[model samples]
Target: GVFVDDHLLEKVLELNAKGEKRLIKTWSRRSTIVPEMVGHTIAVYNGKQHVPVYITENMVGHKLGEFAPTRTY
Candidate 1:
């Protein structure tokens, strides 16, 4: 899963928090699944198109995140 520090979200909130619009385009939901046909792609629920995510074979043995698949391919 993508590790997002409060710093990053704070920045985006700052960017969209300016001017008369006190409301921000906040994202409440996130997805973690994608078809293998797409070859390891991540969909940013709050952003635009899918962001390309690459995981190395060596990382397979690593622990999975809250948003990661339970098993590796």
Candidate 2:
């Protein structure tokens, strides 16, 4: 079983709601991906910038910040 931060889970639900826009911004790289995040957008902080992340079916069970690499190397 994977553990996703519930604190942000609420926010996810908040966006899960019809009242969603901009993008789900977060610095929590360790937060596990969920199916509920599908079709939404994410701005994950990659050290210096909040990189854009497009949530998709394949992205389930993944980390929020994994898409955004802090170092180009």
Candidate 3:
């Protein structure tokens, strides 16, 4: 019951897409961004800590990690 457990078979489940949308902390950087996440802020863990990610339509289809860093600099 983790790693989202299930997939949309391909388009990326985006981790509980149907769940309540709000600012949340996540460690999974591999997850892809969807358009539904636009206009929101997500706290995704970087290497040392979490980073404030403002989701935008342009960001859709990209990994959250690229918007952030996996290594502390």
Candidate 4:
């Protein structure tokens, strides 16, 4: 299992705290899923395109890339 990068985690929290209500975008597919991401919407790029993934409590303990796959076909 991988751990969430402290820098990235802090950035997300900072944005959320400001109530910016913006979609967090990132290509860091290796970033681990954390409880802090819950209730936030992120647009994760999967090489070909950006997939919108909604963070939920149940999604914790997984990787961001797990929800946004690089290939669907």
lDDT of 1 by residue, 1-73 (tens): 6333233244334534452222112222332222221222232333433322322333222222323545655
What digit string (tens of lDDT, one per residue) describes model 2 on residues 2-67? 565454456667877875644566665455556766765665544455445666777656565545
Better of 2 and 3 by TM-score: 2
Worst 10 residues of 3 by lDDT: 1-10
**What stretches of model 4 exceed 4 Å from their correct place?**
44-52, 65-73
Query: What clash pairs does model 2 have?
Result: none
RMSD to truth, every model: 13.9, 3.9, 7.2, 3.7
* Candidate 4 vs. true structure, TM-score: 0.55
TM-scores for candidates 1 onward, in order: 0.22, 0.56, 0.43, 0.55
RMSD of 2: 3.9
lDDT of 3 at 21: 42
lDDT of 2: 0.59
Q: On a 0 to 100 scale, what is the lDDT of residue 72 in model 2?
A: 66
